[PDB]
Amino acid sequence: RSKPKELPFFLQLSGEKVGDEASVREGIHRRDQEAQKKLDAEEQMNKFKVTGRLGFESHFTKQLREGSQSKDYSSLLATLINFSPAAVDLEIRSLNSFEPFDEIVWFIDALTQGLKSNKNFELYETFMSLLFK
Amino acid sequence: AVGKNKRLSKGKKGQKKRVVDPFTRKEWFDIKAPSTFENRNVGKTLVNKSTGLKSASDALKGRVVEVCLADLQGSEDHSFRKIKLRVDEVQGKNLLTNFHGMDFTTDKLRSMVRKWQTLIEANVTVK
Amino acid sequence: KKRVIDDEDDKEVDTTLPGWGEWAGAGSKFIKKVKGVVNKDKRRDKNLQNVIINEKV
Amino acid sequence: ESKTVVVDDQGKPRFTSAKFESRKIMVPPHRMTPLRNSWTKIYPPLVEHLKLQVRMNLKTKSVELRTNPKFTTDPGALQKGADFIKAFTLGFDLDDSIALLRLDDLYIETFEVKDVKTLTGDHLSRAIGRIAGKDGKTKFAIENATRTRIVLADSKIHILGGFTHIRMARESVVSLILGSPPGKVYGNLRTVASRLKER
Amino acid sequence: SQVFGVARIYASFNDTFVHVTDLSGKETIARVTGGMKVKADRDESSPYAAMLAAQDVAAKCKEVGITAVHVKIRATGGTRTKTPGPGGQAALRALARSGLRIGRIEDVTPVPSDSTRKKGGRRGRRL
Amino acid sequence: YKGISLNPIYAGSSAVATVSENGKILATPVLDEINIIDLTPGSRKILHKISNEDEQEITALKLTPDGQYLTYVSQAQLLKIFHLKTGKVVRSMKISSPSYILDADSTSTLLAVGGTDGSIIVVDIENGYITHSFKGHGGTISSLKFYGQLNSKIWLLASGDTNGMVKVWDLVKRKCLHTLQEHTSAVRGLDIIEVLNLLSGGRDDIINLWDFNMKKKCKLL
Amino acid sequence: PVESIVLQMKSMAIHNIINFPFPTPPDRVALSKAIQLLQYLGALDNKEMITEDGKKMSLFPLSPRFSKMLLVSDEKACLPYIVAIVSALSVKFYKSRSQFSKLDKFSDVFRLLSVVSAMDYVPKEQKEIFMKKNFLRGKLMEEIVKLRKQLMYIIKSNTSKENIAVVIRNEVIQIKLLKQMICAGFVDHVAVRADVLFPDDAKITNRTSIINIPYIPVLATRTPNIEDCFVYIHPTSILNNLGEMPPKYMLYYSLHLGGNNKTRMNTLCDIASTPLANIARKGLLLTYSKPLGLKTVNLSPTERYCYVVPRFGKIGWDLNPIAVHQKKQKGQWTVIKFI
């Protein structure tokens, strides 16, 4: 709801638009728009070309992995509470979902430990609802 | 019309089966122009059959072909002119032809006739 | 200065029409002058360093 | 290419891999002056979008369109250009003949007043007067109604447009020749234009 | 090199014949009709009719092997109209697109010198 | 009411029907389709109708002496080679000349097409790529013929013209070996027999027989 | 040739290759190394099934690295040079060696390319005076030419290439594509030079022969023992303690331990970030990161464009951020094409 709002030289007309009722009586661009959308996304990607060297592992997943190694996610709960909501939704949607399901199992472990910790209960349950979303 | 709502008439009661094989039973013959012209060899015509050598001879004796002098002489400036020849003797897939008549083309005649001059026509007979 | 000089100078157009002579086509292949308001050498801002006099005005 | 044979299984062999055209068209002098006048807006679509070598023999008063064996692409380009120059020769406007080049189903039809009804002189003058109308009003009415282009020569008349469009224009013109007043034929024009706009 | 046939294109007012013959007009290679290509009675005088006609005629003509054709268009002639119609122009375009080598275009319409009466009457023929 | 529709088999287009070495198979053009029918004593049936397009008629078609491939040329200047096992067109390529004569080798490895312009092209059947294209004579092709042994190194390709001419070519060298002008009209049929002797049926009246060699030894037998 | 034999088993439907018995079985750790190396090379996926690449390698009767060379070089169209390379590797002297090392192209694969090209350039016994000027071996050189014509015939018969005129003949050059295909052959033997003992800090102080101390960590995650190890250049290679060198990574042939307990790489190719990215992408080691201010358009739940920094990695090193058009299927964001 908050996204903003906004010829060939050889014409190709059809037998009804021109006077060709014989071809009418015996009558026998969405893909262009898809390719156009591919072109606009390509324009966005070649537009942004910042070559600043950034880290491989992000801070959130690094802290989550460290919490799973330590078998305690207290620091992860801390940074989760301190996150910005857009960052929360971007990270939760960009979890990794493979066949071992390591990240999802660790996230559920963290939320169980948090609900046992009994602080910001509204936030922990809305985090789990966002995960199920 | 070959439509299903074309009302049938007396018409197509008894047909024939298309088994004549016409352009296999027909035969190609090359014609040739008199020596007065430059490029004599022009085209090939179609004889109905070869069982009748009389048929080939009579059809080719009756043939009246027509060409244009531009293509006959290589100079395309004789575009408007046109001659008619008629074939009169045959010899072995090769025909000898002679002169029969002449004409212009109607586009040239209409482009000649203008609106602020007088036209004069002479109409003679000779031998 | 270059703008107004090319403005006021006498033009020379090429009225060569492709066509009439020979094959003017994609495969392979009549000049008149119109006097301007002044010639480039008849101007009265030559030899003046920083002056632009418009003879059209 | 070199030539060697490879004997496959089952003894099979194995090998490896290894016209210009011209038209001419005349031009009458009364349409040769506008040809010289607006020639520079004629040859660019012929040479750029059609790939058609153009000459003009002013010694024979003709225009020649020759297509090149390698530079051109489409076969029908030559016939399209010939129809283009033919429409301009018959006397249509330049943009309208460009439209004939631009589309593929525009046709040109021609017929005469003595091919409708034999008229003798002064009546023929009044018949062309009734077709033309005061300052081309009836003529441009037929134009705007049926989406066509009408050219009145001395006697011959020319209609450019789609097939059914020039058919309806021919009907209206023939009724005008037989003597229907411009009020009645204008009412019929706005009726046929109403139903044509609705469809 | 090439071989030439004569494509006589009779663009009638309510029909269209595309008759291809050899030189001299004796042997007829192929012949069609507008209605016979398209099964209606309005559409027997259509550009679509002429296009289908010329496509199948060019098929038969290339079958026999004639690469190039001189073309002789024709209107109905007589005391009727004397100019070839949209059907004829459509047939010509369709032949050129079908790819027979077009050699030379003529318009042999029988223009009466001094015609008889026409079918209309004193008030006018049509409408 | 119950209704059993009986359909025509060899109708419409003037192209020859073809069979393999066994009578078990047949391929036939109806006006746009190629019906394949099995003939077996008693249990003659149909296999599958191929339905490329109703517009263009089949110009020619050929089925190899083993029932494995079907090669057909339609009205547009292209050849479609079609697998018979899977029942699927394997390849299709334009030839830019309306082909009318298709001759396959006894072995299923080579098939040659020939049209009206005079140029012929011979294609490999299993892999649809043309080995070589002969410019040929300037006349319209009326017949072709192959000579190939099962395990050999010499292959001959003979073309019978609308002119009274037969051009025999080497295939492993691709040279105009012998140009025999003997007939007066088209060569409707051709043949090559083992020693070499060559037969040519010229449609006017003639059945020519030429003694023949790889070298310049070729006279009228 | 255990990589090729397990390739043969996979292409002929042996799916329990550890459990597959022999009369005399080879080393199981060795065969598992072969599995992981071909999985990295791209003949096999992470779930051990064959690929189209592996089918082509099984039709090829030769080594997997060399057949990878031939496949990618048949794609990028440098067939005579690559067949010279594989034939040579299978079967003033300093002024001449510099002239045929051909600055700037530092890799001795390109040097011996210049050798074989100048050899086919020169006619007879000037051939002999040329090879005595260049201290070569004429017998090895004719071995190169006969083997390269032979492998030309081999890949013609395997029909990976287009052949007209059936008999097979041998015949700027796009150096980026050349080093790219050499990378495709030479993975996983990667190494990356390190500051500051390698650059121009070490221009002191010897005359007429300067030493620029090679300080280069070697990496390969399929070989985690030698992963991230300091290496020094081999002296017979033409990069013997050279300096002022523009690129950063080198793909080598093989490591070997020699005198003063010093390890050395055999032969080198000078490579950078996006060729490593393309080749490891076709392979396996490019484990990607989450995308990332830069926009990440998502067309469909399956398809998106995004800016990802990939990891070449007991640890590996990472690379530039690349824009990538990747698809989500089978529960992972696999990569189709680069930007």
From Swiss-Prot, chain C:
Protein localization: Nucleus, Nucleolus
Superkingdom classification of source: Eukaryota
Stretches the record annotates as Disordered: 5-29
Subunit record text: Interacts with snoRNA U3. Interacts with MPP10. Component of the ribosomal small subunit (SSU) processome composed of at least 40 protein subunits and snoRNA U3.
Additional facts recorded: Present with 1470 molecules/cell in log phase SD medium.
Known function: Involved in nucleolar processing of pre-18S ribosomal RNA.
UniProt record similarity statement: Belongs to the UTP14 family.
Protein name: U3 small nucleolar RNA-associated protein 14
Organism in which the protein naturally occurs: Saccharomyces cerevisiae (strain ATCC 204508 / S288c)
Residues of the full protein shown: 772 to 835 of 899
From Swiss-Prot, chain D:
Ranges of residues in domain KH: 121-173
An example Gene Ontology biological process: endonucleolytic cleavage to generate mature 5'-end of SSU-rRNA from (SSU-rRNA, 5.8S rRNA, LSU-rRNA)
UniProt GO MF annotations: rRNA primary transcript binding; unfolded protein binding
GO cellular-component term (any): 90S preribosome
Protein encoded by which gene: PNO1
Annotated compartments: Cytoplasm; Nucleus, Nucleolus
Lineage of the species this protein comes from: Eukaryota, Fungi, Dikarya, Ascomycota, Saccharomycotina
Similarity comment text for this entry: Belongs to the PNO1 family.
UniProt KW keywords: Cytoplasm, Nucleus, Phosphoprotein, Ribosome biogenesis, RNA-binding
Chief subcellular location: cytoplasm
Quaternary organization: Component of the small ribosomal subunit, ribosomal RNA processing complex (SSU RRP complex). Interacts with NOB1.
UniProt function note: Required for small ribosomal subunit (SSU) synthesis. Has a role in the processing of early nucleolar and late cytoplasmic pre-RNA species. Recruits DIM1 to nucleolar pre-RNAs. Indirectly required for cleavage at the A2 site of the 20S pre-rRNA, forming 18S rRNA, and at A1 and A2 sites of other pre-rRNAs.
Shown stretch of the complete protein: 67 to 273 of 274
Tagged with keyword RNA-binding: yes
Protein name: Pre-rRNA-processing protein PNO1
From Swiss-Prot, chain E:
GO molecular function, one term: structural constituent of ribosome
Keyword Cytoplasm in record: yes
Protein keywords: Acetylation, Cytoplasm, Nucleus, Ribonucleoprotein, Ribosomal protein, Ribosome biogenesis, rRNA processing
GO cellular component, one term: small-subunit processome
UniProt-recorded name of the protein: Small ribosomal subunit protein uS11A
One Pfam family from the record: Ribosomal_S11
Summary of the function given for this chain in its UniProt record: Component of the ribosome, a large ribonucleoprotein complex responsible for the synthesis of proteins in the cell. The small ribosomal subunit (SSU) binds messenger RNAs (mRNAs) and translates the encoded message by selecting cognate aminoacyl-transfer RNA (tRNA) molecules. The large subunit (LSU) contains the ribosomal catalytic site termed the peptidyl transferase center (PTC), which catalyzes the formation of peptide bonds, thereby polymerizing the amino acids delivered by tRNAs into a polypeptide chain.
Leftover remarks: Present with 29600 molecules/cell in log phase SD medium. There are 2 genes for uS11 in yeast.
Basic residues compositional bias, start-end: 118-127
Subcellular location: Cytoplasm; Nucleus, Nucleolus
Gene name per UniProt: RPS14A
PTM: N-terminally acetylated by acetyltransferase NatA.
NCBIfam families associated with the record: PRK09607.1 (NF007176)
UniProtKB/Swiss-Prot annotation, chain F:
Start-end of each WD repeat: 53-94, 96-133, 136-181, 185-220
Location of the protein in the cell: Nucleus, Nucleolus
Disulphides: none
Miscellaneous comment text of the record: Present with 8070 molecules/cell in log phase SD medium.
Record text on subunit structure and interactions: Interacts with snoRNA U3. Interacts with MPP10. Component of the ribosomal small subunit (SSU) processome composed of at least 40 protein subunits and snoRNA U3.
Role summary: Involved in nucleolar processing of pre-18S ribosomal RNA.
Name of this protein: U3 small nucleolar RNA-associated protein 13
Native source species: Saccharomyces cerevisiae (strain ATCC 204508 / S288c)
Taxonomic classification: Eukaryota, Fungi, Dikarya, Ascomycota, Saccharomycotina
